[PDB]
Design a protein around this ligand. Structure first.
Ligand SMILES: Nc1ncnc2c1ncn2[C@@H]1O[C@H](COP(=O)(O)OP(=O)(O)NP(=O)(O)O)[C@@H](O)[C@H]1O
Ligand SMILES: Nc1ncnc2c1ncn2[C@@H]1O[C@H](COP(=O)(O)OP(=O)(O)NP(=O)(O)O)[C@@H](O)[C@H]1O
Ligand SMILES: [Mg+2]
Ligand SMILES: [Mg+2]
Ligand SMILES: [Mg+2]
Ligand SMILES: [Mg+2]
Ligand SMILES: [Mg+2]
Ligand SMILES: [Mg+2]
Ligand SMILES: [Mg+2]
Ligand SMILES: [Mg+2]
Ligand SMILES: [Mg+2]
Ligand SMILES: [Mg+2]
Ligand SMILES: [Mg+2]
Ligand SMILES: [Mg+2]
Ligand SMILES: [Mg+2]
Ligand SMILES: [Mg+2]
Ligand SMILES: [Mg+2]
Ligand SMILES: [Mg+2]
Ligand SMILES: [Mg+2]
Ligand SMILES: [Mg+2]
Ligand SMILES: [Mg+2]
Ligand SMILES: [Mg+2]
Ligand SMILES: [Mg+2]
Ligand SMILES: [Mg+2]
Ligand SMILES: [Mg+2]
Ligand SMILES: [Mg+2]
Ligand SMILES: [Mg+2]
Ligand SMILES: [Mg+2]
Ligand SMILES: [Mg+2]
Ligand SMILES: [Mg+2]
Ligand SMILES: [Mg+2]
Ligand SMILES: [Mg+2]
Ligand SMILES: [Mg+2]
Ligand SMILES: [Mg+2]
Ligand SMILES: [Mg+2]
Ligand SMILES: [Mg+2]
Ligand SMILES: [Mg+2]
Ligand SMILES: [Mg+2]
Ligand SMILES: [Mg+2]
Ligand SMILES: [Mg+2]
Ligand SMILES: [Mg+2]
Ligand SMILES: [Mg+2]
Ligand SMILES: [Mg+2]
Ligand SMILES: [Mg+2]
Ligand SMILES: [Mg+2]
Ligand SMILES: [Mg+2]
Ligand SMILES: [Mg+2]
Ligand SMILES: [Mg+2]
Ligand SMILES: [Mg+2]
Ligand SMILES: [Mg+2]
Ligand SMILES: [Mg+2]
Ligand SMILES: [Mg+2]
Ligand SMILES: [Mg+2]
Ligand SMILES: [Mg+2]
Ligand SMILES: [Mg+2]
Ligand SMILES: [Mg+2]
Ligand SMILES: [Mg+2]
Ligand SMILES: [Mg+2]
Ligand SMILES: [Mg+2]
Ligand SMILES: [Mg+2]
Ligand SMILES: [Mg+2]
Ligand SMILES: [Mg+2]
Ligand SMILES: [Zn+2]
Lengths: 48, 550
RNA sequence: AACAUG
RNA sequence: CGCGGGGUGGAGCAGCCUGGUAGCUCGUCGGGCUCAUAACCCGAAGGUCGUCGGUUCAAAUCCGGCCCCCGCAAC
RNA sequence: UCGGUACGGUUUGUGUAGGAUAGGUGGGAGACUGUGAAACCUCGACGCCAGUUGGGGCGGAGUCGUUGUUGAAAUACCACUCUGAUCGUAUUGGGCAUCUAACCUCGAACCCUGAAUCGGGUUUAGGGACAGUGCCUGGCGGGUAGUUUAACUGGGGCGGUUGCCUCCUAAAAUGUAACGGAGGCGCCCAAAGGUUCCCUCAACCUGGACGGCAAUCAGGUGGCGAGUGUAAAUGCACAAGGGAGCUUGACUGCGAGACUUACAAGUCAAGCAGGGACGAAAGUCGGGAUUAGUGAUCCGGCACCCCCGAGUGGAAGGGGUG
RNA sequence: UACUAAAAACACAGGUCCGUGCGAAGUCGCAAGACGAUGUAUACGGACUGACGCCUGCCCGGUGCUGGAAGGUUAAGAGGACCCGUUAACCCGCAAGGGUGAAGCGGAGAAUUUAAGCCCCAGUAAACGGCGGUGGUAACUAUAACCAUCCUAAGGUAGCG
RNA sequence: GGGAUGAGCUGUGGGUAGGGGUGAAAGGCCAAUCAAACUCCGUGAUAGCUGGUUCUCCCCGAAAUGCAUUUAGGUGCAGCGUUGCGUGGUUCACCGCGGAGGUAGAGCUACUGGAUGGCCGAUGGGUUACUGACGUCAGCCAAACUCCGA
RNA sequence: GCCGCAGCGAAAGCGAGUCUGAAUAGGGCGACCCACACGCGCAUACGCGCGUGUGAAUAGUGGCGUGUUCUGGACCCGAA
RNA sequence: AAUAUAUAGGGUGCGGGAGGGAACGCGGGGAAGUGAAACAUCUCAGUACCCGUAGGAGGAGAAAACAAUUGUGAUUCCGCA
């Protein structure tokens, strides 16, 4: 009920972060501003 | 070679799967019929094939240059016009590039003269791709076959259930090579389906229908695709061949699982009581109980709660008095010179084709209209309950519980204080399935939701308007054996001719011809009498239109 | 065609 | 000593695991039929779901710990 | 006899308006007397407008035709072919049947054979492309074969326990055993995380409609007796506890010095920079008041970095980071 | 049981069941062969029982054996959509490069077709096996011939103790 | 003591060979050896087990604990012995000085649990024989109680 | 031919340096001599930067001995 | 010969084979104890034992070979790698 999701950037689509969410609380894919190292600045990140 | 194909496709939430291991493939010209219960995934397979969603595993691969159409279970439109409803899709790669050919030829001379050779002739190239580009004389060809509304009026509340006749003309003009028509025969007539019968027969291209009618499934379809709840199984033959081999399959499956359930109980006590029996082997025999008990719970599905219509006040002796009513619009002549009482404790049926005015007649009774020259007496003991044809009380963003309860805790239904969450699961939403949005609900659970916010008053005068749509035979029988046990005045508009033969006591019906198009005949008795009274009083007791050049 | 006993 | 079932109306018992509603067979109280009792037919009454409370909008049910009832237990 | 492929002739299609677009595309004055008025008629196709000149058994004369012009097009006529139907040759595959010639015979007869119930050979009687055997392939298989079946235990067996977190035993640093005494864990939280700004609780006395020993109100005394997402211990009123606004540091690149420690692991960390959030700033943030919520190596899977590429170019595979 | 056990152990006569239509079945053999047998269902091998007299009750759920038109699941063989490596040519630009790619040859191959078995449906217990509880009731008590009920594939009959 | 004209006893020649024979069946018998014979060979099998290991002196000198173990009678690493090269009083004791504690003790109108006699008095019992709290003045107890404290 | 003669890196490689990194930030491993005088933008003083020698001390490889060890029966005897 | 072409078979004449040997060779079959601190893949080992069969030696051998933009030019055997 707590699966491990990975978070991919919007522009370069690299996979930089893995984390846990609750699936009966949040059905849709998360969005966070995290730090993409290949871009050098904070970008948006959905799930896969 | 294959129009459409699937790998190990599994569209699902990880808590609740809706497709699982769907491996099959289709040919060109594959007329398919899809059958199954509600809650299987019949519309979440036709949604992958038109690219409107993506699976969570497995590749869904259309062919190279074959385009696909779709008609969803609710048809969207645009709010512009009616002849706009034949240019958006369908003729959309010709019409948008039709005025531009008339725009590039406005005879500019200072701008460009010899650049009319690589763009105006290129637009001349694409008109030959369609083999016809006048587009006008062959567009009344597409609306004098569906019997469309007059093309110069917007699709506001002006359109009733012939909204579907327009959406069966955006789709059947594109002529896709894979045609995903999901329940086309909602809200249609005794002849609007009869047109669609002969049109889907001689149709070059594949066809997937999720229909329930019998002329398509017995004569047009060649493959039948059963959808079990997550599974998918193809079969070959028409629907008469399907149900015979389905019957002998569920025969030997009915005692496949009897001796399975007998086995689990015979070695239930072997693993629970008396664990003294064997040492250091017991962790190898205990797992064979769990490996058959975890597959005994993947077909344990028999939990189907009944549709129940609550009872409120005592209904008196007068319910609906219609005092020589006329109703119509500017130039239009619907209901004219009609007078009828409404029988206490009796199911009332309404008969008429699309465009006679059946659902406006209930809007008079609740109060959403006003009669032109007439009056309707309500009677101070009745209580209305109006479920609409267009299902307009569904707000497709907020969740299921918030549509029917308005965020409250107790709602007022049967002169009691019912806890409003318990009133939700009474129509089939167990627990954590309140929390999912109503715009994505199934065709059963959008018809098991419109009965929730409209039977919320316990009224002894309920006005059912298209109740027999998108629900299977387990609920359709559980409806008709639940509005017989209701103490008064259920009034039903329907088109399922094998529904009014079950549950009817009175019939209001249209009988108009070329003297006046707004007659309404009243009858005392069931549908198995009106079909015999009609042939002995009137004389009215084909020639198919092509929709294209050929 | 049902009908047992004080 | 310890292990593992079970408690649902006077008696025997379903309902659970896959939460919203308490039900069936005998019996008990009243009517009917008969000359009268059995049989049969119609209507009722009767339960804080063993108890002390944890989550939940909501627990007979999901959840443990205590109290009786039963089964099985030593070379 | 039933189906696939390949080729070939025939046949098939009806919105409305016109003598039912004879279906699409490309051409084109042609058909020659075949009247249609025999028949499975009306080409026997559809039998929906009830009719589309060809198995034509009065004929050799007259032929829907060119002319007529309603409609994107009516117009004869063959040729190329679309979704169907229907017959014909060729090829191949599946089923049953029949035949003899490969194989089968411990049916008989006659030879080598003088002595032969072996063997082989000849003729005959039957079985027959089955059987049997070979290569591959599933099923069955204690009929045989090699082996495993943990430890602790006041002697073994039956019960029970095995890792992680807190307390007591533990003798005022740390550590410390037993089948010693009490309890928890295999999560949960997208805010219950970060920040910035505010607030003081439980119980009680007096009084107050419903209102009760205790629901909310108002005033007094109240220094922590409540509360803490979870078990206990140490903390916490300065708040780490109650409430609100904006947000993602539940970060990428590193880390001097340490605690613990057989080793493998486990734990803390000022500070430096990239880039952010909060805040007027000072600064704070590398998840949760802290200590449980997990698992070494090998073999694999996925996304990226394009590092090596078995002569060379690539590729297969291997490699690095997650 | 030569060398601590001579019996209640084995055998036997008779009984029943299942196998076997004849170089049979079974057995020794990798095979040819041989025994069965110079026999042919009144014969021959396997199993339990054990003269003789009276008898041999109920259960086909479990697991074996026998017979089943189907239906579900299932190996190789057949089948080879789609995808991938390569490059004759064709693109754009810095001709240290990036994009599309017919044919031939390769790797990986999904749909579809296909047998016994297993599942399943029936018969068999002289096949391996199994053959129960609680509560109330009769002129003192005691006890229940009768009734209610649950569970079972069916609840221990004759005879004995 | 039992059979002693039978399923008897016996002589001579022959047959069946080791996961095989034969067995009126006991795991009995197959050259005094049988729950798988004997001989030779792989072979100097293997054994966390047992027994043995031979001349001398001089210096120094242990451990029976920790952690991990298909491990508890075994072993790896550390602890503790010896020795070579480096380091040089860093070790150890006593004195003075700077520090953390919650054991023995004791205390409880400082808390969480208990707990005994009076005054006091709600709920239960028979309109009040009994239940006597929360509180309140004195005396008590505590490994999982501590305002304290060697 | 082996071992020494230069190391870092997964490797292309670069080299008294190299890998990680966006970094002449920090680390990881590896190289790098004083007791002087003179010399020294000379500094209160104290040697850092750099010098000819005043000639700081590095050092490996191959034989034969000894202790332990690896593979072989491996200190010797012993099964069913 | 059956049975005709004829073979099977039979008479006569010349040659040749068989068995033995201590190790070495070539082709073929092929264990287990043991090591893995148990054990099955694995090892032990293509060893022990067996089978065909040589010769004074045998087998191998005159590129359908190797190498990498240079090049060595049949095989066996010992050293390095
Ligand atoms: N909002 C409107 N204003 C005016 N005329 C209307 C409107 N809606 C419908 N109409 C006309 O009324 C006719 C039928 O009305 P409608 O509301 O569709 O009832 P209905 O016949 O029951 N539809 P249906 O259930 O499909 O048969 C249509 O064909 C229109 O001509
Ligand atoms: N996005 C979704 N998320 C979760 N459940 C969904 C979603 N979409 C559909 N479902 C459910 O999954 C099942 C799929 O059914 P769906 O294909 O939506 O229509 P259907 O019921 O299968 N056919 P019909 O009954 O005619 O509507 C139904 O039970 C739906 O309620
Ligand atoms: Mg939320
Ligand atoms: Mg649907
Ligand atoms: Mg309507
Ligand atoms: Mg009588
Ligand atoms: Mg009565
Ligand atoms: Mg075969
Ligand atoms: Mg065995
Ligand atoms: Mg068996
Ligand atoms: Mg032990
Ligand atoms: Mg013991
Ligand atoms: Mg201590
Ligand atoms: Mg101490
Ligand atoms: Mg917050
Ligand atoms: Mg706070
Ligand atoms: Mg994390
Ligand atoms: Mg460090
Ligand atoms: Mg910091
Ligand atoms: Mg910063
Ligand atoms: Mg700022
Ligand atoms: Mg926590
Ligand atoms: Mg390993
Ligand atoms: Mg290469
Ligand atoms: Mg790769
Ligand atoms: Mg890194
Ligand atoms: Mg004896
Ligand atoms: Mg004897
Ligand atoms: Mg004796
Ligand atoms: Mg017999
Ligand atoms: Mg045989
Ligand atoms: Mg017989
Ligand atoms: Mg038998
Ligand atoms: Mg016996
Ligand atoms: Mg007997
Ligand atoms: Mg059976
Ligand atoms: Mg069978
Ligand atoms: Mg008896
Ligand atoms: Mg004698
Ligand atoms: Mg005698
Ligand atoms: Mg005698
Ligand atoms: Mg043996
Ligand atoms: Mg050896
Ligand atoms: Mg030894
Ligand atoms: Mg000494
Ligand atoms: Mg040691
Ligand atoms: Mg030492
Ligand atoms: Mg001191
Ligand atoms: Mg001191
Ligand atoms: Mg303490
Ligand atoms: Mg004390
Ligand atoms: Mg006290
Ligand atoms: Mg007291
Ligand atoms: Mg103390
Ligand atoms: Mg450095
Ligand atoms: Mg020597
Ligand atoms: Mg010889
Ligand atoms: Mg071995
Ligand atoms: Mg072994
Ligand atoms: Mg071993
Ligand atoms: Mg060993
Ligand atoms: Mg030679
Ligand atoms: Zn990015």
């Amino acid at each position: 009920v707590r699966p491990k999701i990975t978070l991919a950037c919007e522009v370069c689509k690299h996979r930089n972060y893995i984390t846990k969410k609750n699936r009966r609380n949040d059905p849709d894919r998360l969005e966070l501003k995290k730090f993409c190292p290949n871009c050098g600045k904070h970008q948006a990140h959905r799930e896969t | 070679e294959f129009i459409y194909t699937m790998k190990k496709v599994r569209k699902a939430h990880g808590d609740k799967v809706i497709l699982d291991d769907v491996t099959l493939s289709f040919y060109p010209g594959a007329k398919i019929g899809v059958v199954g219960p509600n809650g299987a995934g019949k519309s979440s397979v036709l949604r992958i094939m038109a690219g409107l969603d993506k699976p969570n595993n497995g590749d869904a691969f259309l062919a190279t240059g074959a385009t696909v159409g779709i008609l969803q279970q609710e048809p969207p439109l645009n709010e512009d016009k009616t002849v706009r409803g034949n240019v958006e899709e369908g003729m959309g790669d010709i019409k948008i590039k039709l005025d531009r050919f008339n725009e590039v030829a406005e005879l500019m001379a200072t701008d460009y003269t010899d650049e009319l050779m690589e763009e105006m002739g290129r637009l001349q190239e694409e008109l030959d791709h369609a083999d016809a580009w006048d587009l006008d004389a062959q567009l009344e060809q597409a609306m004098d076959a569906l019997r469309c509304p007059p093309a110069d009026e917007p699709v506001t509340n002006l359109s009733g259930g012939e909204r579907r006749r327009v959406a069966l003309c955006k789709l059947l003009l594109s002529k896709p090579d894979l045609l995903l028509l999901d329940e086309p025969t909602n809200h249609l007539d005794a002849e609007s389906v009869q047109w669609l019968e002969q049109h889907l027969a001689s149709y070059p291209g594949a066809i997937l229908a999720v229909t329930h009618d019998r002329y398509f499934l017995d004569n047009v379809a060649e493959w039948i695709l059963e959808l079990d709840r997550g599974r998918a199984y193809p079969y070959e033959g028409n629907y008469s061949t399907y149900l015979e081999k389905k019957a002998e399959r569920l025969a030997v499956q009915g005692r496949k699982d009897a001796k399975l359930q007998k086995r689990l109980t015979e070695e239930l006590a072997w693993v629970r009581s008396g664990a003294k029996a064997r040492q250091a082997k017991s962790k190898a025999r205990l797992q064979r109980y769990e490996e058959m008990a975890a597959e005994a719970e993947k077909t344990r599905k028999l939990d189907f709660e009944e549709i129940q219509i609550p009872v409120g006040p005592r209904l008196g002796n007068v319910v609906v008095e219609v005092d020589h009513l006329d109703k119509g619009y500017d130039g239009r002549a619907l209901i004219k010179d009609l007078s009828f009482s409404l029988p206490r404790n009796g199911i009332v049926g309404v008969i008429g084709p699309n465009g006679v005015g059946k659902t406006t007649l209930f809007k008079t009774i609740v109060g959403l209209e006003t009669p032109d020259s007439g009056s309707v007496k309500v009677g101070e003991t009745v209580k209305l309950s109006y479920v609409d044809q267009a299902r307009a009380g569904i707000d497709p963003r907020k969740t299921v519980w918030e549509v029917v309860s308005d965020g409250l805790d107790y709602i007022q239904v049967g002169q009691t204080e019912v806890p409003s969450r318990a009133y939700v699961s009474a129509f089939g939403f167990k627990g954590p399935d309140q929390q999912k949005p109503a715009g994505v609900l199934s065709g059963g659970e959008r018809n098991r939701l419109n009965l929730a916010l409209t039977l919320k008053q316990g009224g002894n005068l309920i006005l059912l308007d298209e109740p027999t749509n998108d629900l299977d035979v387990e609920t359709l029988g559980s409806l008709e054996n639940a509005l017989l046990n209701f103490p008064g005045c259920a009034v039903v508009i329907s088109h399922d001719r094998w529904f009014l033969d079950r549950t009817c006591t009175h019939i209001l019906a249209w009988e108009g011809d070329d003297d006046n198009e707004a007659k309404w005949f009243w009858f005392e008795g069931n549908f198995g009498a009106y079909e015999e009274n009609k042939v002995e009083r009137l004389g009215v007791d084909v020639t198919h239109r092509k929709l294209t050049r050929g």
